Amino acid sequence: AKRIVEPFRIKMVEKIRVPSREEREAALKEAGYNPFLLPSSAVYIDLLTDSGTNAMSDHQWAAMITGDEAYAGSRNYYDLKDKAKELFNYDYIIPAHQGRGAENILFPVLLKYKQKEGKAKNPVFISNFHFDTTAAHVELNGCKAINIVTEKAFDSETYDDWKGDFDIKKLKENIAQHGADNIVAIVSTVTCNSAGGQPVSMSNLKEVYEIAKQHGIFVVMDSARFCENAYFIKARDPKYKNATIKEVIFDMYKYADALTMSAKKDPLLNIGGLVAIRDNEEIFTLARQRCVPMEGFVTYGGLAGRDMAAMVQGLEEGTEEEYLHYRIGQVKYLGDRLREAGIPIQYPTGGHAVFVDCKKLVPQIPGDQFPAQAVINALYLESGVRAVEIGSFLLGRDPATGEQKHADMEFMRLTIARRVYTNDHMDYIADALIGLKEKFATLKGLEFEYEPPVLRHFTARLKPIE
Amino acid sequence: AKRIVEPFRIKMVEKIRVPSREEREAALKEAGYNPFLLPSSAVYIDLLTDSGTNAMSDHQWAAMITGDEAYAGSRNYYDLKDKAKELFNYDYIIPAHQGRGAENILFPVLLKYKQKEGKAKNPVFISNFHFDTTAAHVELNGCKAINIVTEKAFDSETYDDWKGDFDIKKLKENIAQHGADNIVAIVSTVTCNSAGGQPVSMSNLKEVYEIAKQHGIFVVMDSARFCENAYFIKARDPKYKNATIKEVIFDMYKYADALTMSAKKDPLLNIGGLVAIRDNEEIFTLARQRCVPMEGFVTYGGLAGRDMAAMVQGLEEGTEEEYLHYRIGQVKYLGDRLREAGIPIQYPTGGHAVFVDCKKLVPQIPGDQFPAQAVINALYLESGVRAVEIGSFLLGRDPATGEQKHADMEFMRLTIARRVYTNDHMDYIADALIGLKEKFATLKGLEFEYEPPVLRHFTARLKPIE
Amino acid sequence: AKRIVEPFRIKMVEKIRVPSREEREAALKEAGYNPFLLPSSAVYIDLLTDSGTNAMSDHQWAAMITGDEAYAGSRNYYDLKDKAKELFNYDYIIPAHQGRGAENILFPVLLKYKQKEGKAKNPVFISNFHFDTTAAHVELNGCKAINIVTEKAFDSETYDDWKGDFDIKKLKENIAQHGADNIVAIVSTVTCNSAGGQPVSMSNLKEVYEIAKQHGIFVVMDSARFCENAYFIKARDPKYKNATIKEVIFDMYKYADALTMSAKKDPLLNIGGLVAIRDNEEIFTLARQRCVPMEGFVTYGGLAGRDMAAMVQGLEEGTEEEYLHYRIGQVKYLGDRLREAGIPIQYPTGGHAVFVDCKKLVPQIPGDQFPAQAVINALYLESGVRAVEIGSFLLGRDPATGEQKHADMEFMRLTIARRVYTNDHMDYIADALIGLKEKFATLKGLEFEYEPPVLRHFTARLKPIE
Amino acid sequence: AKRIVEPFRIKMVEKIRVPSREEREAALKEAGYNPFLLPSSAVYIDLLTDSGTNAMSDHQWAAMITGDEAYAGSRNYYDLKDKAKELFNYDYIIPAHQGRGAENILFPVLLKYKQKEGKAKNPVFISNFHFDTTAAHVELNGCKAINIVTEKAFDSETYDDWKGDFDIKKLKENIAQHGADNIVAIVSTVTCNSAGGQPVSMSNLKEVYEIAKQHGIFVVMDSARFCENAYFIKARDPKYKNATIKEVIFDMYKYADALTMSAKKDPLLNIGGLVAIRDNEEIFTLARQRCVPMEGFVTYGGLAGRDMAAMVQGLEEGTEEEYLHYRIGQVKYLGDRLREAGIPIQYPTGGHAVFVDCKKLVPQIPGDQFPAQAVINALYLESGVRAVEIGSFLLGRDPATGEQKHADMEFMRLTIARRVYTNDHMDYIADALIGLKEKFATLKGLEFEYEPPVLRHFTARLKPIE
Ligand SMILES: CC1=C(O)/C(=C\N=C(/C[C@@]2(O)C(=O)Nc3ccccc32)C(=O)O)C(COP(=O)(O)O)=CN1
Ligand SMILES: CC1=C(O)/C(=C\N=C(/C[C@@]2(O)C(=O)Nc3ccccc32)C(=O)O)C(COP(=O)(O)O)=CN1
Ligand SMILES: CC1=C(O)/C(=C\N=C(/C[C@@]2(O)C(=O)Nc3ccccc32)C(=O)O)C(COP(=O)(O)O)=CN1
Ligand SMILES: CC1=C(O)/C(=C\N=C(/C[C@@]2(O)C(=O)Nc3ccccc32)C(=O)O)C(COP(=O)(O)O)=CN1
Ligand SMILES: [K+]
Ligand SMILES: [K+]
Ligand SMILES: [K+]
Ligand SMILES: [K+]
C-alpha cells in the first residue's frame, strides 16, 4: 500500500473524538440498528458519504464571503454560467440546491418532452446504473429505471479498467424491446457509484451517445463524480495519457446533451447542484419553469449566492490533476491495506470509496437479510467508524412488484470525503475492519421494524435476527 | 416621518453603485422589460425582495464557521429541533432548503393523508391569502387555492389594525360549500404577504383554529414573517401589550397544527426553510418520507450544516423586539415619507415592505395590463432602484379556466431587506418615486411576449404597449 | 445639516446596547473618572477613537482568509510593497503592527543617522503637530518635539481652508534657532490630528519639503489619515479640482522622504502599520535592523499575513472618493447639527471627528483642570456615549520643566469610526450633547489621583474637584 | 517510527507546490544564500518556524468573527484576564502583539525596578538559555544574558529526561560572582528552544525559584512553549503521572513571578503575545506605562480584538492532552525516521521541532563557517523544504568583545507548525534529508557578504566559500 502526500497543507481543523464502547452500543440500539439515525456526536470517523462533507479551500471560503446574495441576476450566476461553458461547452445552466433537486428539475421535463408526440406510452430510463435518488425520481414520475452496467462489475476480484461501462449489447436490446419512443433518456453516471465508483471509458461514452443519437434519444450525464471519472480516463486510456484533465472532461461532454450534477461531490462543496444543457433551448426553458416552484428563482435555484461562488471555485479545484492523484490515491491506499489483509473489495478501487464485498465476508447472511449492514453495525460498535450499505438494503423494492430488487452486489461502502482525512485516519479504518476477521462468521442479519415505501435505507429501523 | 436608530452598528460593508441612465435602459430592454431578468450590476438599491438578502450578525457567521456538515445527525439539527420546541412548542422538525421546498414536503403529504379513507375527491386549501409559490404547490397537487382575506385589506388608505385577518364569514361559508372532507388544510399566513405584509390578530388566528378543530381540519402556519406578525400583535392587541415577543409567538402557535417557514425572511438568513409539526407523528413520518427524495436526508433537508447553525441563531435574533421595532419602524418611515408627499400606499405599512397602490397611482392602465409593473419599470429607469409587482401579474391565471385571476389590489412593492439599508437609503428611494409624480399619467401597460404557464412573473418577458 | 447616503450597504451587523444610568455612574466611578478605563459593555456608542474600530468590506475579509501566514516572504508582503510603489512611488516598505510601532522603527533610526555624522548634539523634531504617541517617541529618544501649526488653528470658530498648515515663518525661525544639524527630521502630519483633523495644503507640503531639502533635513509624512487630507486638497485647492484622489496622494508624497502610517485609520483596518521609504536605501537597511527585535521579521513586522492582506485591500478602498465624500460628510453633518444648536466646534470640521471647543463651553473650569474631560464625563453619564479629550490632559507635562504643557486648544473629540455608524447614530450623539446646555456652567474640573509620567491620559485615574 | 493519528479532521486547506530545481537555485542566489530572504512562493514545505504558522480551529475562527474591536475595555480583554487567572493563577495581564513585544514591555521595567536605590549597577539576566530575540532585548538594555543550560544538553545522542534544565551549580556560581543585586531576573524558558525544545523538570523549576527567592531575584517564565513543557513533565515525572495538564501548568507557574509569552506557538495563533504578572501590582503598573508608547493601549497591546478572542480559545486548545500527544508524537515520528536512517538528532526530540546535529553531520565545516546553514541550503536546493539554523550563525557575536559567541551546538531545526502538516509530509522531509548522505562531506561553509550587528541571521547575506 502506497501513501500519497497531500498537495496542500491544513489551514483549519475541527475536533473529533472516539465515543466509548458503551456509548456506541446504546446509541446504535436507540437508532434502531440503522447508523443513518445516529447523531454525529456518536461517530468518530464518518464514512457514511462523500456528499457535502468535503473540506473547502481558503479560496472557496473567500469566494463565499464576497458572494452576491442578490435574488435575481447574482454576479455568481453569470460566473457559474461562464464556468460551465468553459468546462463542458454547454450554453445553458440552472443551479439547484443539490443533485436530487437537479434531477427533480430535469427528469419530469424530459418525460413531458418525450410525450409531446404521443410517445413515452411505457416510459423508461436506461442507465449504466441509477443511484438510489436517481432511480427514485425516475420511478416517482411513473417510469422504469433500467441498469445495464457491464457484467464485469459483478466480479469483484477480477480487475477491469472500466467496471462502470454500459453493456452495449444490452443497450441495443433494450432499445429494441421498449422502442426508442419509450426511452425518455439515457443517463450516463460518471463515475458509476453503484458499481463501486468505477469509471466509464471515453469509447463507451462515445458509443452510447452515438447509439442514442441514431434513435433520437436524449442523453443526461450524471456528473456527481465526473472529475474522478476523467482522472481514470487519463490514467487508463492510452489516447489521453498526455491530455489535461480539462481536455478529458471537454471530450466527455461531447457525448451527452445535458447534465445533472451534485456539486456536493467533485466540486468539493458542502451543498449545491447544477443542471446544464448543451444547446436545446426548449428543454432549458421548460426546466426553468419547473425550477421556480421546486428550487427557487432561475439565477439561484435554491442556493445562497455564496454557495454558487464556492461552486465556481470548486469546479476549478476539482479538476486539478495533482489533487485528483492524491484523493483517488488515498482511496487506493485504504483498498490495498484491506486487500493485503485478505478482505475482498471491488477491484480496482474507484475514485471516492472502497466497497467491501460482503457477499464473500459473510455468506451465511442471505442478501434479503442485508449482510453488508451486519458488517457495518459490527464495524461501528467495534471502532466508532460509520459506513453505509450499497446492496439489497439501499436497492429497496421493485415499485411494480413489491418484492426485493435483485442484488448483484452486496457492498459495504467506506466513503471518503475529499481533503478531510489523512492516511493515518485510513490506517484506523483498515485496522478496525481487519480486527473483525474472526467475527464475520458470527454476524447475524437484520429484519425490518419500520420500513418506508421509498428510499427505505435512509430511515428504516432494524431488529437483529438473533 | 420618524427615523429609528439601528440597535446595532455596522461590522462589514458591501459596495453598491449607481449605473448610468443608458445602462439601465439597455438592461431593461435586454431583460424583456421584466426587472426579474436584470443582473445585479444594473441595480443600485435592490428592493426586489426581502427574501435571502438579509444581513446576518457576527454571531450568525460564527455559527456557520463551527457548523457541523455531517450528513446524518448534525449537531445543528438537534439545536434546531430544540429551538422549535422552545419557540413554537412543536415536537417534530424537518429542515428544508427554503420555503417552497418546505411546502413541497408537507402539502402533498397533507393531500394524501386527507384522502386516506376515500375522501377529499375535490381537494382545496383555505387561506387568508396563499402567496404565489404556496398557491402553486396547492395547484400542482391538483387542489384549489382559495383566498379569503378581510375586505378591509382592499381599502388601502383606510387604517385598520389587522388587514391580514381571515374573513370568518367566508371561512364558515367555504367549509359549508366544499365540506370539511375536501379541505386538506387551512393555511394561516403571518404576516399576510399578499395583503401588504399585514398582520393577523391573535383572536382571528384563535377563531380560525377553533373553527377548523370543530370540523377536524388541519391548520398550517405559513411562517415566513411570523416575528413581524408577533410584533404587530404586541403593538396593537391590548392583551399582549405587556407581553414579550416570545410569549406572543408561543400563543400564535397554539392555533396551528404545523408550520411551513421560509427562513430567508424573519430568521435573517440568505437561504433556508423549515417544517415543524406540533404533535402529529404520523404526519411527521410521512413528511420525512417525502423529504428524502425531494430535499435531502431528514437531518439537513437540503441545507449545509452551517446554514442550519445560522438558522438557530437567526431564529433567536429575529424575535428581538429592539431589532423588530427598528426594522418595522424603517418600513414605516419609508411609507410615511411617501404618504406625506401624497403617494397612495397600503396604510398602515406592513412589516417588510411599503406597498404602493398603483391603481390609484395610474388609473389609465387596466388591471390586465399590469399597472404597477409600469410604475416599477419607470422607477428603475429613473433611479436604479428595482422593485417587484404584487397584482395581476403575480396572481397569474386560474388553472381550470385559464384566465386572469381577478386582482383586488395592484401594488408596487418596495421590499426592504433586514439590516441592509439605512434611513438615508430610504430617503433616496422616496425622493426617486416622488420625482415621478408628473409622469405617472403618461405611463402605459405591458403585454406578454413570453408567458410561462406557472408563476409567470419570474421569467416572463413583456412588451410595453405603445 | 445635510445627510449623505452610504456608497455601500450593510453585510454584517454587531449588536449595541444602552447601559442604564446606574451602570454608567457605577462604571465611571470604578474607572477613576477616566472613560478610557471603562469596559466596552458599559458603553453605548463608542466615540473614543477612529483607530482600529472601522468596519471592513467583504473584500477585506476575503483577502484575510486567503492571507499567507508564512514567517518569511509572505505573498501579501510583496502585494503590500507594490501597493506602496503604486500609491506613494516609494521603493521600500517595512510593515509594523501599528502606528507607534512604525515610529519606534523609524524615529530612533533617524536620530542615530543624524548622530553618525556628528550632528544632533541638541536634537529636535519639528512638525505641524506631533500627536501624543508621536511626541512621546521623540521624547523617549532624548529629543524635543516642536509644534508649529498655523495660529489659525487656535481660532476655532473662524473658518480656514488649511488649519493643519505648518507656520513657514516658525519653520524658518526654528531652523535658524536650532540649526539644520540639530533637526533630526520634520514630521508632516496629514491630516493634523491635534488641530482637529484639519488638512495641510499641497503648496504648504511643497514649501516645507523644499525648505528641508535645502538644509538636508529628512521629511517624514505621518500618514494615519492621508486619504482624508487628499480629499480636502481636492475639495479646496483649485489646482486639484479635476484630479483623482490618487493623483493628489501621488503629489503629496513627492514632498516627503518617508512615511510612518497607522493603517488602523484611513486604510480601514482593525490593526496594522506601515513604514515606507522613498529611495534612501541606507535609512531602509537601518530601519530593517531595528524592526527585527522590536516588531518582527522584516516581511511581516508584527502583523499576521491576513492583516497585511487586509491592508492591501483597505489601502485601495480608503482612496475612493465616493466613500471619502460620505465619511467626511457624515462628520460635517454631526458638526452642523451641533453648530445649529449653538455648540462651539473647531470650524470647519475635520475628516475624522468633530472637536467640541470646551474652552468656549465651560470657561469656569481652568485648562489645568481639564474642562473637556468635564464635558466628556458628563456626556457619558447622560447618554452612554464615550468621547475622548484632546487638550491639556492629552498634552501632558513638558519633560524639561515637569509642568503642564501650554495648551492652545481644549477639545472634546467625538471620533467617528469609518463605515460603522449611520447618521441616525449621529443624531443620537448630537441630541445628547445638545441636552446638556443648561448644565455646562455647573460642571467641575478634575484632579489627578494617579498620573503616569508618559502618556498620562490613557491610564490616569481622576478625582472630581469639589 | 510510530505514526499517531490526528484527534481532528481537516476543515480548510491551503495549496502548496514544489518549485522546480531551476527556480530554487535562482531563488537562493537571489536571497544571498539566506533562506530567510526567500519568497514563500519558492518554498514547498516550510519548516522555518513554528511561530505564527499554526492552523486554528473552527472555534478559534468563530471567536475571531465575534471579537470585540473596541479600543478600550474589549470584552475579549477581560476573557483573557480571566483565562490567565485560571491557567497560571496570575492576577494581572498586559496583551502584547507577540513575544518580543512582551519582552520589550517587561524587561526594561524589570531593569529600572531593580535599579531603584542605586543597585543593579552591573545588570545581568540568567536563563537556562535565552533565545535570540530574548537575549537581544537583554543586551539592548545594557545587560548581560547568561545562559546556563545543563551539560547533558550538549550530548545529542545520549538520552536525558530534562535536557532543558538549569545547571543549578552554575546558577549558584553566577549569583555569587555577580551578586544578587545585579541580577535583574532569572528567565525560565519552557521548553528550552535553544537546547532543542527540551523540557524543564518541575523539580528544576522549583529549586531555581526557591534559590531566586532566597536572594530576592525576580523570575520570569518565558512561556512560548509552556504546554509542550507541561506534557513532558506528565510523560516523564512519576509524581504527575495521574495529573491533568492544567494541574501541571498550575504547578509550573508557582515557580515564577511573571511570564512573557509568544502566543504564536502553543496558543495555536498566527499573531499575539502576552505579559502576565502574579501579584506585583507595581511591576504591573510600570509595565502598563511602557505598553502604551511601545505596543498600544493596555487592553489590546497591539492586537486586534479578534486576535485576543482567538488567544482565549487557543489557550484552552493548546492544553488538551490528546492534541499534545499527537503534536509531539508527530515531531517524534520525524525524529525516529531520521534516527533510524543514521541521521544524528538531539535525542530525545523536543516539543516543536527536530534538531539535526550538524556538528556530527558535516565535520569538515568549522563553526565559524556555519555548518548547519550549509546543510539547510543543500536541503532546500534538493527538495524545496526550508529549515532554519540554530548554531553559530544565530548565536551572533558577544556585545562586549565583538567576536563570534562560542557555540556548543550546531543544529539544523526542522520546525513543525501545529496541525498543518500530515505524517506524509514528515515522510517527504525525512527522505529528502536521507538522500543527501553522499553529499554531506562535500558541502562547505559560508561567509558574510552583509552582516547586521543585531540579530544578524534574519537578514544577513552570505557567500558560499568555494
Ligand atoms: C450518482 C449520484 C449520486 O451519487 C447522488 C448522491 N449520492 C450520495 C448521497 C446520498 O444522499 C444519495 O443520494 N444516496 C446515498 C446513499 C448512501 C449514502 C448517501 C447517499 C452518495 O453518498 O453516494 C445523487 C444525488 O445527489 P444529492 O445528494 O446532491 O441530492 C445523484 N447521483
Ligand atoms: C408567505 C410566503 C412567502 O412570502 C414566500 C416567499 N416570498 C418571497 C420570495 C419569492 O421568491 C416568492 O416566493 N414569490 C415572490 C414574488 C416576488 C418577489 C420574490 C418572491 C417574497 O420575496 O415575497 C414563500 C416561499 O418561500 P421561499 O422563497 O424561501 O421558497 C412562502 N410563503
Ligand atoms: C497622527 C497619528 C495618530 O493619530 C496616531 C494615533 N491616533 C489615535 C490613536 C490613539 O491611541 C493615539 O495614539 N492617541 C490617542 C488619543 C486619544 C484616543 C486614541 C488615541 C487617535 O485616535 O487619534 C498615531 C499612532 O498610531 P497607532 O494608534 O496605530 O499606534 C500616529 N500618528
Ligand atoms: C523562547 C522564545 C522564542 O522561541 C521566541 C520566538 N521564537 C521563534 C521566532 C523567531 O522569529 C525568533 O524570535 N527567533 C527565531 C529564530 C529562527 C527562526 C524563527 C525565529 C522561533 O521560531 O523559534 C520568542 C520571541 O517571540 P515572538 O516570535 O512572538 O516575537 C521568545 N522566546
Ligand atoms: K453538508
Ligand atoms: K440569497
Ligand atoms: K481594534
Ligand atoms: K503569521
- DSSP codes joined into one string, C369-406: G-HHHHHHHHHHHHHS-B-EEESHHHH-B-TTT-SBPP
Is C427 known to be catalytic? no
Q: Where are the beta strands (DSSP E) in C111-175?
A: 124-127, 144-147
Q: Which residues surround ligand 7, an ion (CB under 5 A)?
A: C 52, 270; D 69, 304
The whole-angstrom distance between residue A157's C-alpha and the CA centroid of its chain comes to: 22
Spatial separation of the C-alpha atoms in residues C396 and C384, rounded to whole Å: 26
Is C55 known to be catalytic? no
CB of A224 shorter than 6 A to ligand 1: yes
Min Cα separation C396/chain B (Å): 33
Give the closest ligand to the alpha carbon of residue B51.
Answer: 2
Q: How far is the CA of D84 from the centre of ligand 8 (A)?
A: 23
Please give the angle made by the CA atoms of C277, C279 and C283, to the nearest 5 degrees: 60
Q: Which long-range contacts (CB under 8 A, 24 or more apart) does C210-218 make?
A: C211/C168, C211/C171, C211/C172, C211/C175, C212/C186, C215/C175, C215/C180, C215/C183, C216/C180, C217/C175, C217/C180, C217/C183, C217/C185, C217/C186, C218/C110, C218/C113, C218/C184, C218/C185, C218/C186, C218/C257, C218/C258, C218/C283
Instruction: Give the helix ranges, DSSP H, for A66-150.
Output: 75-88, 99-114, 132-140
The technique is X-ray
Per the CB < 8 A criterion, the answer to whether C297 and C70 are in contact is no
Q: How far is CA A242 from CA A234, A249, A250, A251, A315, in A?
A: 8, 14, 14, 14, 22
Count other C-beta atoms under 10 Å from residue A159's C-beta: 10
Count other C-beta atoms under 10 Å from residue B214's C-beta: 10
Q: How far is the CA of D296 from the centre of ligand 7 (A)?
A: 10
Please give the angle made by the CA atoms of B161, B166 and B170, to the nearest 5 degrees: 135
**Which residues form the pocket of ligand 2, taking CB atoms under 6 Å from any ligand atom?**
A 297; B 48-51, 98-100, 131-134, 189, 193, 222, 224, 262, 264, 273, 388
Residue B141: CB partners within 8 Å, gap ≥ 6? Answer: B107, B108, B111, B123
- Nearest CB partner across the interface for B68, out of A40, A294, A305: A40
Per CB-CB distance under 8 Å, the chain C contacts of A58 are 65-66
Cis peptide bond upstream of B348, omega within 30: yes
Instruction: Count how many Cα atoms sit within 13 Å of the Cα of residue C290 in the half-sphere of its side chain.
Output: 21
Per the CB < 8 A criterion, the answer to whether C131 and C145 are in contact is no
C-alpha cell at D217: 531575584
Q: C: neighbours with 3+ CB pairs under 8 Å?
A: A, B, D
Nearest to B57, CA basis, from B49, B69, B65: B65
Q: Which residue has the cell 452495449?
A: A168
Strands B92-96 and B144-147: unpaired
Please give the angle made by the CA atoms of A221, A224 and A225, to the nearest 5 degrees: 100
**Backbone φ and ψ of B182, nearest 5°:** -95, -5
User: Quick check: C427 and B3 CB within 8 A?
Assistant: yes
- Nearest CB partner across the interface for D12, out of A56, A421, A422: A56
What CATH number is given for B1-57+320-462 in this structure? 3.90.1150.10
DSSP assignment letter at C414: E
**Which residues form the pocket of ligand 4, taking CB atoms under 6 Å from any ligand atom?**
C 297; D 48-51, 98-100, 131-134, 189, 193, 222, 224, 262, 264, 273, 388, 394, 415
Mutate to test the pocket of ligand 3, among C36, C49, C105, C274 (most ligand atoms within 8 A of CB): C49
Cis peptide bond upstream of B191, omega within 30: yes
The whole-angstrom distance between residue B200's C-alpha and the CA centroid of its chain comes to: 14
C-alpha cell at D92: 494581572
Min Cα separation C247/chain B (Å): 22
Is A250 known to be catalytic? no
Q: Which residues pair with D356 in a beta bridge?
A: D345, D412
Spatial separation of the C-alpha atoms in residues B465 and C9, rounded to whole Å: 36
First to last CA, chain D: 38
Spatial separation of the C-alpha atoms in residues D110 and D58, rounded to whole Å: 38
DSSP assignment letter at C43: -
Per the CB < 8 A criterion, the answer to whether A256 and A277 are in contact is no
- Which residue in A10, A59, A383 has the most chain D C-beta atoms within 10 A of its own C-beta, making it the best mutation to test that interface? A10
- DSSP calls for A424-457: HHHHHHHHHHHTTTTTGGG---EEEEE--SSSGG
Per the CB < 8 A criterion, the answer to whether A374 and A362 are in contact is yes
Spatial separation of the C-alpha atoms in residues D8 and D60, rounded to whole Å: 14
Q: Which residues pair with B412 in a beta bridge?
A: B356, B389
Q: Where are the beta strands (DSSP E) in D52-160?
A: 56-57, 92-96, 124-127, 144-147
**Backbone φ and ψ of C247, nearest 5°:** -65, -35
- Amino acid at position C241, single letter: K
Residue C130: CB partners within 8 Å, gap ≥ 6? Answer: C138, C145, C147, C187, C189, C194
Nearest to B192, CA basis, from B138, B157, B150, B155: B150
Residue with CA nearest ligand 4 atom 25: D99
DSSP assignment letter at B240: G
Residue B192: CB partners within 8 Å, gap ≥ 6? Answer: B128, B129, B149, B153, B163, B164, B198, B199, B200
Q: How far is the CA of A368 from the centre of ligand 1 (A)?
A: 22
Per CB-CB distance under 8 Å, the chain C contacts of B421 are 9-10
Q: How far is the CA of D359 from the centre of ligand 5 (A)?
A: 53
Residue B82: CB partners within 8 Å, gap ≥ 6? Answer: none
Rounded to 10 deg, the angle between the B168-178 and B202-214 helix axes is: 20
Per the CB < 8 A criterion, the answer to whether B9 and C13 are in contact is yes
Spatial separation of the C-alpha atoms in residues B142 and B123, rounded to whole Å: 8
Spatial separation of the C-alpha atoms in residues A303 and B47, rounded to whole Å: 20
Is A224 known to be catalytic? yes
Spatial separation of the C-alpha atoms in residues A376 and A387, rounded to whole Å: 6
Q: How far is the CA of D280 from the centre of ligand 5 (A)?
A: 52
Q: How far is CA D380 from CA B195, C396, D387, in A?
A: 71, 54, 8
Min Cα separation C294/chain D (Å): 6
**Backbone φ and ψ of A241, nearest 5°:** -60, -30
Instruction: Count how many Cα atoms sit within 13 Å of the Cα of residue D324 in the half-sphere of its side chain.
Output: 27
Q: How far is the CA of A133 from the centre of ligand 1 (A)?
A: 7
Nearest to B53, CA basis, from A70, C225, A257: A70
DSSP assignment letter at C37: G
Q: How far is CA C290 from CA C285, C287, C297, D274, D453, in A?
A: 9, 5, 10, 21, 10
Tell me the structure's resolution in angstroms, rounded to a single decimal.
1.9
Strands ordered across the beta sheet of C258-262:
C92-96, C273-277, C258-262, C218-222, C183-189, C124-127, C144-147
DSSP assignment letter at B265: S
Spatial separation of the C-alpha atoms in residues B341 and B148, rounded to whole Å: 32
In this structure, the dihedral spanned by the alpha carbons of residues A182, A186, A192 and A198, taken in order and rounded to 10 degrees, is 110
Per the CB < 8 A criterion, the answer to whether A309 and A316 are in contact is no
C-alpha cell at D58: 473552527
Per the CB < 8 A criterion, the answer to whether D129 and D170 are in contact is no
Q: How far is CA A139 from CA A119, A128, A134, A148, C254, in A?
A: 18, 16, 9, 17, 75
- Backbone CA torsion sign across A150, A151, A153, A159: negative
Q: Which residues surround ligand 6, an ion (CB under 5 A)?
A: A 69, 304; B 52, 270
Spatial separation of the C-alpha atoms in residues A318 and A332, rounded to whole Å: 18
- Interface size, chain B vs chain C, as Cβ–Cβ contacts under 8 Å: 116
**Residue burial A357-375, b: 16+ Cβ < 10 Å; e: rest:** bbbebbeebebebbbbbbb
Cis peptide bond upstream of B49, omega within 30: no
Q: Which residues pair with C189 in a beta bridge?
A: C222
Nearest to B336, CA basis, from B241, B429, B231: B429
The nearest alpha carbon in chain D to C51 belongs to: D71
Question: Which atom of ligand 1 is the closest one to the Cα of A48?
Answer: 18
Spatial separation of the C-alpha atoms in residues B191 and B162, rounded to whole Å: 10
**Backbone φ and ψ of D103, nearest 5°:** -65, -40
Per CB-CB distance under 8 Å, the chain D contacts of C137 are 293
User: Quick check: B307 and A304 CB within 8 A?
Assistant: yes
Q: Which long-range contacts (CB under 8 A, 24 or more apart) does D369-372 make?
A: D369/D444, D369/D445, D369/D446, D369/D447, D369/D465, D370/D410, D370/D445, D370/D446, D370/D462, D371/D410, D371/D443, D371/D445, D372/D410, D372/D411, D372/D412
CB of A191 shorter than 6 A to ligand 1: no
Instruction: Give the helix ranges, DSSP H, for B15-146.
Output: 21-30, 58-65, 75-87, 99-114, 132-140
Q: Which CATH topology does D58-319 take?
A: Aspartate Aminotransferase; domain 2 (3.40.640)
Q: D: neighbours with 3+ CB pairs under 8 Å?
A: A, B, C
C-alpha cell at C335: 458638526
Q: How far is CA C309 from CA C60, C269, C276, C313, D269, in A?
A: 8, 11, 17, 7, 17
Question: Which atom of ligand 4 is the closest one to the Cα of D225?
Answer: 1
User: Quick check: C62 and A66 CB within 8 A?
Assistant: yes
Q: Which long-range contacts (CB under 8 A, 24 or more apart) does D314-317 make?
A: D314/D56, D314/D60, D314/D263, D314/D267, D314/D268, D314/D269, D315/D83, D315/D87, D315/D263, D315/D267, D316/D83, D317/D57, D317/D59, D317/D60, D317/D268
Q: Which residues surround ligand 8, an ion (CB under 5 A)?
A: C 69, 304; D 52, 270
Spatial separation of the C-alpha atoms in residues C258 and C279, rounded to whole Å: 9
Residues D125, D407, D457, D460: which is the catalytic one? D457
DSSP assignment letter at B200: P
Instruction: Count how many Cα atoms sit within 13 Å of the Cα of residue B31 in the half-sphere of its side chain.
Output: 26
Give residue limits of the domains in chain D: 1-57+320-462, 58-319
For residue D292, the SS3 value is helix
CB of C373 shorter than 6 A to ligand 3: no
Min Cα separation D410/chain C (Å): 22
Strands B183-189 and B219-222: parallel
For residue D462, the SS3 value is strand
- Amino acid at position D127, single letter: S
Residue B197 Rama label (left phi>0; alpha psi -120 to 50; beta): left
- Which residue in C68, C97, C290 has the most chain D C-beta atoms within 10 A of its own C-beta, making it the best mutation to test that interface? C97
The residues on C that touch B, with CB distances below 8 Å, are: 3-17, 45, 55-58, 61, 419-425, 427-428
Per CB-CB distance under 8 Å, the chain D contacts of A333 are none
Spatial separation of the C-alpha atoms in residues A357 and A360, rounded to whole Å: 6
Per the CB < 8 A criterion, the answer to whether A228 and A266 are in contact is yes
Give the closest ligand to the alpha carbon of residue B296.
Answer: 1
DSSP assignment letter at A407: P
Is A357 known to be catalytic? no
Q: Which residue has the cell 530554487?
A: D24
Strands D258-262 and D218-222: parallel
